[model samples]
Target: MTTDAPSFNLITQPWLPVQYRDGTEKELSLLEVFKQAPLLRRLVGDVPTQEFALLRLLLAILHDAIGGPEDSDEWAELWTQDEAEQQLPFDCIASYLEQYYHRFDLLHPTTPFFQVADLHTQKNDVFSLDRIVADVPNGELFFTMRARGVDRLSFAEAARWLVHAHAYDTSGIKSGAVGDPRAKGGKGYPQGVSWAGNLGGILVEGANLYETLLLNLVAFDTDNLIVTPEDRPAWRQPPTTAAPADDEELAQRPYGLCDLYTWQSRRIRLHYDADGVYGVLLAYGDPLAPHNKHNHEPMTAWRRSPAQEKKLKKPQVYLPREHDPTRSAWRGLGALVAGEASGAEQRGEAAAIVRPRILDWVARLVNEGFLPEDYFIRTRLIGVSYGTQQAVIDEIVDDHVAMAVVLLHERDSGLGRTAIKAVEDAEKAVTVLGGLAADLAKAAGADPETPRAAARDRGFGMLDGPFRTWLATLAPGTDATERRRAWQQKAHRIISDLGRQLVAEAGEAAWNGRVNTDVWLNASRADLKFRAELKKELPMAT
Candidate 1:
């Protein structure tokens, strides 16, 4: 340990980015965040995934600091507080951070925050800051504002990316660090992208940062999911010892929320001086499989995987259901709305989808009258798609849908079922539109595949905004039947108009009918069929 090394204490330093209620954005320390949480709007980060990572860190701290809202009754105690009294218990948070004061320091002699003080490549080599910074993708400098390689990063900037790196860094080979057995031929082989990358991450958000924290803080006794009181974050755990071999993965599940939230998927060591951090050494750490951690992980929805069942020879295998990059949050409402009872239904050999446990936790609050049915919350979905062979990030998905709490109620809540049905109606309406396009193309003697797909996408694009607006109107004491029909009428009108435009634009060739075998095809005939299908799908429409 060097006596003269500089220290960058995260508890007191301005590194976390947050916006205040009065329209101000500033970087704050860990202590300052809790002390002023109510006045803070939301966390601001370099990327959406970074914000997710940072939020988990704060929740981990809160979970251990206050020693649990432990059960539903305790959770309600905190939830029932008035606005001014709803702020996080900062006194407890301050003492907890002080207990681990040296652990949060970025440049602590032996116990740096989230980094291994002695991590090194066999050749004692270090890589560029771009390796850790997300905005500047490796080998894609042209896409970023800084067209040059990332040579150095300020301490604050480095700290943010450091945390991000452990959460969402790419998979594949890494530098072979010394004092570890994982290296073979000087390479740290593929483990998989960091833990959060395995998730189609979902977060329940409120108007302020304090509310956002409480919304996601699932207590230990929420559903009798037992976790030991000893469960603690990585910072509190003994420093990581030996590295796991390439094939010797961590077989056990995380100890608890604090432990999982700060899961160390990678071991990082930064190179810095008095000025800034210039380089880093990153290597594989603990590797967790994404199969069926549903009880512990509350932030991602789950789906039954037949392929996994066949390979693992298990009766059922549920993996984290990642987001479809092409689809928006509102389009994927069915998975979010399905309750445990409905999700557990078995059909022949297939198991039902497992909604995110976090949403289930929220439904418990609403069902128990902890939160009013009319209260609104936004379900934010975030995901990262890795490129070929799960190497670099191909795309990042960030989208949210705001709706009344009634839509998240427990099983058999008529309002929730109606919401799911509305999504299905939109899909059917779009399918009809696509069929109309194919028929018109067939009459013109042109290829129908491209036209059909394009028309379907356009139909969805037009209805996206309207669905969000309609969803926001649902609340307690509302007529579910009328609400669903209202959505159908709006969607039916919009799509019927799009169908007319396609027929009008069909050239002279489509106007002249073509008789092929048993059927006669023309723009006029196609329009008639489209209206019929639309009526069948959305009968309540006027």
Candidate 2:
């Protein structure tokens, strides 16, 4: 470790390390460090640091990633700048670099090793950008590197490579690295192929540069998902590798976020000891984990706040109030809310807030025709083979939007209102019922983290089987009108009975008053009539 200064200018000292293959190392200012690395020079060249993806990621980790202001006027403003933009009212690069100078850890690595991964490999002909020391935390391919003191060459090199990792995550970029026998013409970084290399490393939302830069940590892949305890994962600052490391370096690999960092997604507590970080970690979490993992959830997926509930109609209210994505969420919150209000309320509100933003983005993607429609059609939380960390917007959209599609279908047949009520029943039926089943299993020690009989099969009785059959009927060229119409009439009532059956089987009082299916069936003598029509044509699948 170097100086204990609370903060230092990245522009003045060797906060970032640089080295050449011949066992040579040079430590200099940020600008000098920029000049030395071919990747940094070519990619960030002349571009304001605010616009540079690498610099943004680092600063995000430096400030917002740990615990600091999530956004700024200048950052949000600059972030709104186009990728092709060069001229601005001011240079965000110089401004941010200076403003955040005192916040950086002075990295001085005198003896850095320049890595050149072998062009030859058993899997491929050649090419890899493993030049600096870097470690990919968790199965999510989000890379981390550390550079704090002199003689820490690999640490410095690792930072640059780790930054470059964002610009060149595995899937998208076709750019081969240098010394690759496969590349006859040119390769990555050293050959100036960085800008087009790919820019999707971080999971941060793109709005203004403040957003894109301020919150830029992302996972590349999830081959080695962290199976550690519920909340331990963070971006470890180097000297750690998958190969292995002892106490001093990147040891104590965390599993995932224990709590909340951004909202809908989970955020683990950033492991801290105060003086300076022994290992700087960012918030990480499983997306599928319960909104309240420990106990009763005051709110799960909310449609609106108390005020909005007053104004919107029964079906008029669809989802959340749309948060303008063009604006800065951080800036908005910084001015609008307190960072430490109460831990419990923080989560409930966070989920409510981020969800609308995601839905709006997804709505745009659909309009831009940027993605497939099926992509928008979310699974009814059936499969257990997915990352709970991937917060599915579909979970909300499924009952609401998906049903709206069917309502629209029925609208053509004059059953819009009927469809709405039916869908509403379906929503309350599945959601309310799903919770009880999982809660029961959780009580029995068989939760989402580890499912047993009821938890694993609950979705089947509640919606999965029926939903699957219903969904398939809507496929291309299929005449599903008559069938769905029939379902629209009896879907809720039958699903309600199924839920009653499942919960009844559990034989627990925890199931009784906490849930009520009778209110939904009150209008009609639901028992006999429901059974008479139940088997008519419904797939009635188990």
Candidate 3:
């Protein structure tokens, strides 16, 4: 509703209070002052700061006549070589115009006093508005505006024109040589007035169809550069120096004129809020000293070297090949034994024996290709303690059951007896161990509760309970060997029930048959293999 351009408060600097050609001195402020100007207000009132910044850049081009000399004799000879060489003062003037007329709308017929499309078509091969605004001729509209007088537009009028033009037609409108009641002379649209004049006056209007197309292209192509809302301190004044002694000052200044200019440009970009216009102005006049390249290189390079240095300092650890598998199995068994041996002397001895045995097993497993060499690690042994020892045994049983369930679940199940046999072997071991458990605990001065607690702590209580219960069920039988056999049968039944439950829970899809077979068979054979390996290594048998 209230279309006022934001105020910008300019800090006083060496270049402050720039005097224009008309002798009117203008100043800048951090508070936006261009909003007060009618033309600027109309141009940028409703637009976002980023869009307005872009529009300001384009308008500044028109206002300053930044590109090549125009055809008009009066303007064509306006800039002399000496004056052009002193481009900074002129650029400052353009910056002033940008700030002063920040609210002016160039698109409106009443303000900017020129149409970009008209100028674009007049000089080049005639083409449709769409094609003229295409990427082939990037910044075609800005170029057209530049051909006209950049400084000629009244801020109030330009602002109004932009607001009106942007409201209906942000893309430039295309007008044929047709007379409209609103236009001057009504001579079916007067010609020969350079693009600059067209911008200031009203013409046939809907949207500037060509300009609109061009605008859309620009919207798509142009990147919006904005000043992020961050802590940006105001520009600091450079220290003043006394006139340099002819020889001494020249010697002290190591950089040439080009370097000096580069440094100065960087200072401006970093320390001042020129609204992204300074870079464009510099690039337009001298293409070689591109603003972005000059401003970004030093800062970018400064931040990258440290990261590279840190990466270079990192250390890498590599293990001996032979140690790999042995270490892995040691780690696995160490973990399992550690869990059971927390405070038990037998646990420590058992662990001491089991650790080496596991490493040897791992070496053999790898050699046999049952386990990958890479899988060998000290930590792998730790994985065994994650579940109860009985639970581990149960897992072996479950694997077999899983295979059986898969085979049985399907029609015409071709299930093998291998899994059942493995289960039977494990059951026999459990029966043998059940009879020995009481004697073993007694030999170790451990209560029955000790094994139960150990199993619970190690997550094997689930299996331990059923095994012990089955043994109790067989305790009533008379014959010692017969009782042991009966105990084995009952334990086998309990293990089968557990295996079935596990298989039921896992479902057949995830069951690995070969892995199940290895686990069940290996666990059943652990006693025989462990004993044989010990006997071979040391003749002392327990």
Candidate 4:
């Protein structure tokens, strides 16, 4: 490697895409980002997951920069100052960035930021820039704006893609790096997408980037997560050409948030000239499984894994709960806000659900009086769905729900319980509406599945917006019961109206009577049954 290899320093370069408070967007250096985080609205990435991936990078920086919000008290002190001043500890972050200056360089010859300087294929073979650039669709180019495919990425663009590639690259075989023992016949086999890909990536949003970072900067809680003396991010550690052991090849655990945030999920060497990155070598770097990582990872919810429990012969095993692509974030509120005691005790020792630790941290802040009960925040759910054996980007799930801090109280605040229960009410009401569609279809001598699904979809769609508004309005010291009852009434009316519309759409075929066994069926009869079932499901409304 040449001593004078063209340098592109990430710390000083304008790489991060941020939107200002006035809605003006621009890229800013890492130094400027922290210094002016309050003036910035939020990070705006090329893709939603890019936003998520980059946010995690920023978190890594925050965690390392301060050395500690070592505990809640320290975090609270920071929050107090942050809320008052509307800025992060600028001097601290600036100093930290300066100390790590060379490591932030995209092309530092010896230790490139998030890249292996000497990572090479057996034949020093390089692939196209599209391998690292995510915007270009795999195989199918017609859907993407980059019809010609990614050829050359500017230093700034390459830097962004480099981080994203480490965080959310597709799973499958790849061009094997030279020194990796796991490589065979010049190939690196499947190891699943990087760490973030394994999560139903959740982020708690605040008024601005400053608040957002502070909101998620959970104090080191030892009960679930491990923080060791050796815990440090990849940048702090010596740069590696090849691992002595891959994460999958041998089991490994992240030291802490910093280690996990900048997890090296691949061994990548960017092929670049003075112009920019044009090609690259990519191979599996590390593989961290989602099983029972609830302690270390705070962002995603967890589900008790009976199969894992049985397979491992262990009790109370859990796995990162991935998002249901079909469902909205509000629809899954139960998993987000349910308290540990309530979730476990109600279901016995063998509880099935665990809320995201991030929410628990927020709940702690609220309970400790660090945050006001009425403080509003948005919970954003972001994740990737892979297709064809987890080798391709299938779909991205990006959705958010706005609510008050009281809704995340650790003991299941009145508002929290009501909000979760309201989602259940919506589910039950929609189910009844689907039954009406099925009944009408049967009466019309038509396939019931399509109509049933359509009716359920229509019912939920009608309620989604209104439910969001209702949830956002709730707070502590409010009439939780009355608010819940109000939601039930609104849901009943919406579901009922949707059912009626379906009945009207059923036409004369469904309106006319038809005999099935001993009972005569028609749209009228279906409506009566739907009304009865809906009333049963939403009795609070009555």
Q: Each model's TM-score, in the order given?
A: 0.92, 0.26, 0.15, 0.92
Q: Is candidate 2 or candidate 4 better by TM-score?
A: 4
Residue 183 of model 3, lDDT score: 22
Better of 1 and 4 by lDDT: 1
* Model 1, span 1-542: residue lDDT tens: 35487889999999999999999999999999988888888999888988899999999999989886787788776664367678677888899999999789999879998988978776788777777887666643344555364687889989999999888989967777677787875688887999999999999998889899999999788663546676889888877743752453344448778988999989889899887998888888888788867767888888777778889998877788788888778888887887332234452222234678788888888888888888889999988888788878888889998988888873365888888888888988999999999988887677999999899988999999999998887888888899999999999999999988888767534467732522345666778988998999899998
Better of 2 and 3 by lDDT: 2
lDDT of 1 at 353: 40
Q: How many residue pairs clash in model 4?
A: 2
118: Cα error in model 2, Å: 46
lDDT of model 3 at residue 49? 19
lDDT per residue as tens, model 2, 460-500: 35554454345334422334445455555455555557655
For candidate 3, write residues 148-222 as lDDT tens digits: 222222333232222222211211222321212222331112112111111111011002111111111111011
Error of 1 at 448 (Å): 1.5
Model 1 alpha-carbon drift over 4 Å, by segment? 1-3, 139-149, 224-226, 245-252, 339-353, 410-413, 508-521
lDDT of 1 at 315: 82
Which model is ahead, 2 or 3, in terms of TM-score?
Answer: 2
Model 3, residue 374: C-alpha shift (Å):
53
Q: How displaced is residue 331 in candidate 1, in Å?
A: 1.7
Off by over 4 Å in 3: 1-52, 55-124, 131-542
Top model number, lDDT = 1
Model 2, total clashes = 25
Task: Please estimate how well model 1 matches the true structure, expressed as its whole-model Cα lDDT.
Answer: 0.83
